[PDB]
Amino acid sequence: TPEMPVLENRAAQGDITAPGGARRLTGDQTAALRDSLSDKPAKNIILLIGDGMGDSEITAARNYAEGAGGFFKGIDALPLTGQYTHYALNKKTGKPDYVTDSAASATAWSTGVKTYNGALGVDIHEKDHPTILEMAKAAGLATGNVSTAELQDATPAALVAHVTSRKCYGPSATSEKCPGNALEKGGKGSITEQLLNARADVTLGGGAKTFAETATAGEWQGKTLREQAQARGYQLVSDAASLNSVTEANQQKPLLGLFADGNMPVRWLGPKATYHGNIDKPAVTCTPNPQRNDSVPTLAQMTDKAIELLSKNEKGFFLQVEGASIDKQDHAANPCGQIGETVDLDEAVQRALEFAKKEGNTLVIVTADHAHASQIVAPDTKAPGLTQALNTKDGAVMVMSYGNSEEDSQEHTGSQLRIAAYGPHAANVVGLTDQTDLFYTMKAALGLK
Amino acid sequence: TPEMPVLENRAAQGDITAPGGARRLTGDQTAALRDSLSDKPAKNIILLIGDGMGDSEITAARNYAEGAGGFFKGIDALPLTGQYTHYALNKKTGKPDYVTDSAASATAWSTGVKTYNGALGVDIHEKDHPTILEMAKAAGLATGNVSTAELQDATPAALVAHVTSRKCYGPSATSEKCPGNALEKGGKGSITEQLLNARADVTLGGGAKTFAETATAGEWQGKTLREQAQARGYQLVSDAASLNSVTEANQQKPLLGLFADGNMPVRWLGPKATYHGNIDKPAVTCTPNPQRNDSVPTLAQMTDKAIELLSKNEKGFFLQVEGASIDKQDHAANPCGQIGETVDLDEAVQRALEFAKKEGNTLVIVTADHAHASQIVAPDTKAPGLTQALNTKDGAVMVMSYGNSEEDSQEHTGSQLRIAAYGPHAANVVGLTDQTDLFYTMKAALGLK
Ligand SMILES: [Mg+2]
Ligand SMILES: [Mg+2]
Ligand SMILES: [Zn+2]
Ligand SMILES: [Zn+2]
Ligand SMILES: [Zn+2]
Ligand SMILES: [Zn+2]
């Protein structure tokens, strides 16, 4: 009998100061890896994205929360790993633009085509390309889209919308920013409108604010997008109690969970990094956010409910889960927010892996859209940017640095980064790959045409 | 009949602006990965280290020299990849020190034990631990140590020396900095004296300057370390002609190649990055160093000759090859020097792979000791540090940033980084591992006790 193993434990095996104490392996891995290889078709796919979660963000998060010799039971447990490229294209020239934003990267793994920074679901010629979610739905599979960001944000929107600018959230921004996509100009509609038309079985996230807008044209002109949603049969839910109450989500009663106006709350708080903060200020210990809430579902809860609902479909399902705030907090130069959000994503990955290990036909993939700014530097570092000293689980201090922008927001970077997977077809993430190979790998694993 | 494949081509398959044109894969990878898995013993090991070559350095060098959609025929062709941690230990507390130097990291993979920054071949208690080279030689395998840095430098020294400070290059620095290791105090000697005692079959690099010092005690007291070398039967060689003339290197006539006084010359020139250099200055095109020479062997040449000489030993061989200046040029904030050194290492990795593919029992490993400073940022970036715009092979501009030090030297960083391998036992680099796991993997692969 054949089953696929998840690395149970890759923590340092003992005393890190002694010979062999810092090893993470206990014996040869060949047989274990041979057992992980399967070209059987995947019935399901769970894609987990940590926005801005390059290797440096994973390392910093692990150091702080599990200690240097620790191990994330979710993020570090996928057995097949590689590194992939995520460069975008300059719209005018069609040449590579080395540092992507969240919109062009999302489109690349969701459509299989490179695009310009800011586009959602269209190529450099502004032509629409079908997404993996739309194709899944067309083959009759259940579909889910979960995120801690506004649902109009680049990452979850890329699966359901095709607009020339990521800024075209609702009817008003669209009329002014994406005229050709404007409903009243004959277009498909703003991000939110196209989201409602896409009709995924399960959509959960923040972004309730934009649903307050009213349609400028169409069958539901004059009424709010929230009204249109209920009118078209959506089960609206807005707190954890209600979310747990849901027992079925399907094309007849698709679920829409709006848990916050903008982005859902961050798990941990901490002060922002400051100039010479590692020398001028005391070390920081992060504190849980008192307003994250008992009534606000966490990403792992959302992941669990999404899995429960989507698995009732005998055909199979595609679910994308996004740990959205790693990137946002990285932009904010806030180590605690950033680390808390990676820890949060780890819990959702654990849920996904438990299901997959038991179900056996599920491909789980964990990766990021692009790299980000934070760097782990020596404690006595005198850097030109923003730094902060943190008290880690090891009882030592780790210094983090943000030094790629004099502006207010720290920027993305173009380093290739880790992709890891488990399950049927995971072999296709090993070695060097491109972000658009992700679209083809998932399309082939599910056997879509 | 079973053979293990190297990735032949992972360059973008077509037009990067079109659907599927940016894909690096042409079909399912399962069978190919299954064919790469073997637990057969390794007769030989080739360990290639890019100093400071984290994923960011690899991406920057690929973008510049092969284009974003290109592919390093050496660096990117290894089929089994993972990420590994390299934290060092605080000497006093024994707790993790998140950002390692080159001395503690080389000690970790060459001994299997974590140590403090600055130590070579000793643990935090200053106890000596045998290296993979010393163990290989004890089992009767041929051994080689090749680098473009001074042979007294941390990376190549770690295989043959055990001193409490990496600064103890020769007799004089040792007397004052490593009193306990000083020969005239009864110690084993300075780095260069221990290198002469270790007697690897092939040692090639820079660092002839220190051999001008004279021993303070011992059998060869009063004469230069160069003189001692000839007295002990070493074949001294100092240019490429001489290097090519060598037809055998063994324990009777070990080879010592001193090609420069300090570090061997860098491949490419270019100006240093500067404050607001991507906005204030024109884009840079790197230029081949006129003084890199016809009489100075290149890293690939050194690698070839080392492989020819060490392969005559029927028992097998261990060879470590270091592209040293990637890290050094990264510190200097000089993109061209840094990229040129990465390109240079790629050529050496290609020679090692050709041999391995044909020999069939060689484990080739390519990785770095720690990550470094350089980041690939957006072209319009206003950063607080040093930046520079480069004209890449794609005909687009890529901006590189160094923003983690207000000092003169750019600093190392602690992000986990790529490790890739090919051949028998390569499965042990996949997933998350620690740098000390690498010592154990090599020892097992060669079957050492
Ligand atoms: Mg996002
Ligand atoms: Mg070095
Ligand atoms: Zn992003
Ligand atoms: Zn971002
Ligand atoms: Zn180094
Ligand atoms: Zn260095």
From Swiss-Prot, chains A, B:
UniProt GO BP: protein dephosphorylation
Protein's name in the database: Alkaline phosphatase
Biological source species: Escherichia coli (strain K12)
Binding site residues for Zn(2+) 1: 327, 331, 412
Assigned GO CC terms: outer membrane-bounded periplasmic space; periplasmic space
Subcellular localization(s) per the UniProt record: Periplasm
Cofactor(s) it depends on: Mg(2+); Zn(2+)
Major localisation: periplasm
The organism's place on the tree of life at top rank: Bacteria
Disulfide bonds: 168-178, 286-336
Gene3D superfamilies, A to Z: Alkaline Phosphatase, subunit A
Binding site for Mg(2+): 51, 153, 155, 322
Cofactor note: Binds 1 Mg(2+) ion.
Catalytic reaction list: a phosphate monoester + H2O = an alcohol + phosphate
Similarity field: Belongs to the alkaline phosphatase family.
Quaternary data: Isozymes 1 and 3 are a dimer of identical chains, isozyme 2 is a dimer of heterogeneous chains, one of each of the subunits from isozymes 1 and 3.
Binding site for Zn(2+) 2: 51, 369-370
PROSITE patterns: ALKALINE_PHOSPHATASE
Top enzyme class: hydrolase
This enzyme's EC code(s): 3.1.3.1
